[PDB]
DNA sequence: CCGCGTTTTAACCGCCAAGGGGATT
DNA sequence: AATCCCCTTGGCGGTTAAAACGCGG
C-alpha cells in the first residue's frame with residue numbers, strides 16, 4: 001500500500017534497494033500511527049534502517065522530536081559512532097561515564113533543541129529510570145530486543161510504562177525459547193492504554209496469549225506436520241503478519257557460501273561412566289537440577305571434580 | 321518553537337561540527353592501530369643494542385665455467401704472488 | 403587431526419571455563435598453536451586478539467565461550483567450528499555460527515556437535531532442535547514485505 | 552605451581568622466586584637445596600614449575 | 611590535602627534448565 | 636482438594652560503584 005519514499009536530503013550514504021524497501025515499510029508503520037517489531041537477520045544493518053527511519057521522519061515531516069536509543073554498552077559506542085558516520089544531522093547526546101558526568105550531561109537539558117536524540121544503556125536506564133520517566137519521547141527505538149526478552153525481568157517492567165508516541169524493537173529472532181518471549185515483545189509494542197480513566201488493552205495478556213495460541217502450537221511441536229494443525233499455524237502467521245518484519249539472509253544475500261552440519265556420538269570412559277552412575281544413583285532419591293548440572297559436568301570431563309593425584313613420598317617429621 | 325528552516329540551519333552547523341569530530345576520530349583510530357603495530361614490531365626486534373655480532377652462513381652457490389676459470393686464475397695469481 | 407591435515411582451522415565452543423582449561427591442556431600436549439577468548443577479556447584486548455586471529459594464519463584452533471558470544475565480533479577467518487557441548491538456547495548457537503558464517507565469508511563452513519551416547523546430551527540436543535522447530539514454524543513463513551505468491 | 556617471573560639469588564644461597572598464576576601472583580624464598588634442584592632443571596624466566604614444600608621436589 | 615586521572619573489582623542481574631512448594635476455588 | 640508464581644541452584648556472562656590508589660603541587 002506504499003511505495004519507495006524519497007531518499008532524505010540529509011542522509012549521507014548509499015543505502016541499498018532493499019534498505020530503501022525496509023525504510024518504506026517503517027515509514028508506513030509510523031504513518032499508520034502504530035508500532036512494529038523488526039526481525040531482520042544480522043549484518044543487514046538494523047542500525048542503518050533505524051537511522052534511515054529517523055532521517056526520513058526528520059526530513060519529510062517535522063518529526064524531529066526527542067528520540068531514545070537504548071543499547072548494550074559496547075554496541076552503544078558502536079551505535080554512536082555509526083550514527084555520526086551515516087547521518088550526523090542530529091545533535092546526539094551520549095549518556096556515559098560516572099554519575100557526576102551523568103549529571104553534567106544532564107545540565108540544562110530541558111532547553112528545547114539542545115539535543116535531538118539520546119543513546120542510553122539497558123542496565124543504565126534500569127538503574128536511572130526515575131530520571132528519564134519525566135519527559136515523554138517522540139520516537140523510541142529498542143535495539144537488541146533479545147535483552148528484554150523476559151517479561152519477568154525488571155528491565156521489561158521498567159521500560160513497559162514509558163510514555164512515548166511510537167516504539168520499535170530490534171531483534172535477530174523474536175523467539176529464542178518459547179511463545180512467552182513472543183508475547184512479551186508483542187505486548188511491549190502494544191500494551192494497555194488508559195484514556196479518561198478507562199482501561200483499554202492493545203493486545204491480549206500473557207496467560208491469555210498462551211491459552212489462545214500456545215496450546216495449538218504445543219500440539220504442533222508434539223508431532224511433525226491435521227487440518228486443525230494447519231489452520232492454527234496459518235492463524236498464528238496471519239495474526240503475526242501486521243506487526244512483524246523479517247527478511248531472510250538467504251535470498252537477499254545471494255553470495256553466501258554453503259554450510260554443512262555434522263553430528264558425532266562420543267562414548268563415555270570408565271571414570272566418566274562411574275561418576276555418571278554414582279551421581280544418577282544419588283539423584284534418584286536432595287535437589288534435582290544441581291544433580292543435572294553435575295551430570296553434565298561428568299559428561300564434559302572427570303577432571304572437573306578431582307584430578308589424578310601427583311604421587312609423592314610420605315614425609316616423616318623427624319628421624320630416630 | 322524554532323522553524324524548520326532554522327532547524328535545518330542548526331542541523332547544518334551540527335553536521336559541520338560532527339564532520340570535524342569524525343575526522344578527529346578517524347585520525348585517532350589510525351594512530352592507535354599504527355602504534356599497536358609499531359609496539360609489536362619493537363617487541364619482535366629484541367636483541368643486544370649496538371654490539372658486534374659474529375655470523376656463520378652456509379648457502380648453495382651457483383657456478384658457471386667462466387666463474388670456475390676466474391677462480392682458477394685467482395688461484396694461479398695467488399700462487400704467483402707466493 | 404583430520405582438520406589440520408585438510409588445512410582447515412577449527413573453532414572450539416564450550417559452555418564452562420573449566421572445559422576451556424581442560425581443552426587448553428589437551429591441545430598444549432598436542433602442540434597446536436592457539437589463542438583463547440574468555441569472559442574476563444578486556445574490551446580492547448578482545449578486539450585486538452580477534453584481529454590477531456583474523457590476521458595470523460599460524461594458530462589452527464581458536465577457543466571461545468559460547469555464552470560470551472551474545473556480544474558478536476567479526477571472525478570471518480574461520481573455516482570450521484566445533485561445538486564441544488550443547489546449550490539450551492539455540493539462538494546462542496545460531497549467533498556462534500554467525501561469528502564464523504556471516505557476510506563476507508568465502509569458505510564453506512562445517513558444523514560439528516559433540517554428544518555422549520545414552521546420556522543427557524541427547525536430551526539437550528532434542529530440546530535444542532525442538533526449540534529450533536518452533537523457531538522454524540514461526541520464521542519460515544514468508545513475511546518479507548510480500549503476499550503475492 | 553606457577554609461571555616463574557623472577558629468579559634472584561639472595562647473595563649456596565637462598566633464591567627468591569616469583570610465581571604467577573591465573574588467579575594471583577606470589578613471591579617465595581627457597582632453601583639452597585631447592586635452588587640446586589631448580590638450577591639443575593634449567594628453569595628460567597617464563598618456565599612453569601611445581602614445588603612440593605613438604606619434600607622439596609621441583610619439577 | 612585534595613583531588614586528577616586510574617585501575618581493579620564486589621556485587622547484582624539474566625540465564626536455564628525440572629521439578630516442588632504452598633497459597634487459591 | 637487440584638493448579639499458578641516463586642523457589643530452588645550451579646556455573647556462566649555482562650556491568651556499574653566503591654576500594655584502594657601514584658602523583659602533581
Ligand SMILES: Nc1ncnc2c1ncn2[C@@H]1O[C@H](COP(=O)(O)OP(=O)(O)OP(O)(O)=S)[C@@H](O)[C@H]1O
Pocket residue numbers: 013014015016019041042043044045046047048172474
Ligand atoms: N548502505 C550501506 N552503506 C554502507 N555501509 C553499509 C550499508 N549498510 C550497511 N553497511 C555496513 O554494515 C554494517 C551495518 O551495521 P551493523 O550493526 O553491523 O549491522 P547489524 O544489523 O547491526 O548486524 P548485527 O545484527 O548487529 S550482527 C556497518 O558496518 C555498515 O558500515
Ligand SMILES: [Mg+2]
Pocket residue numbers: 075144
Ligand atoms: Mg546489533
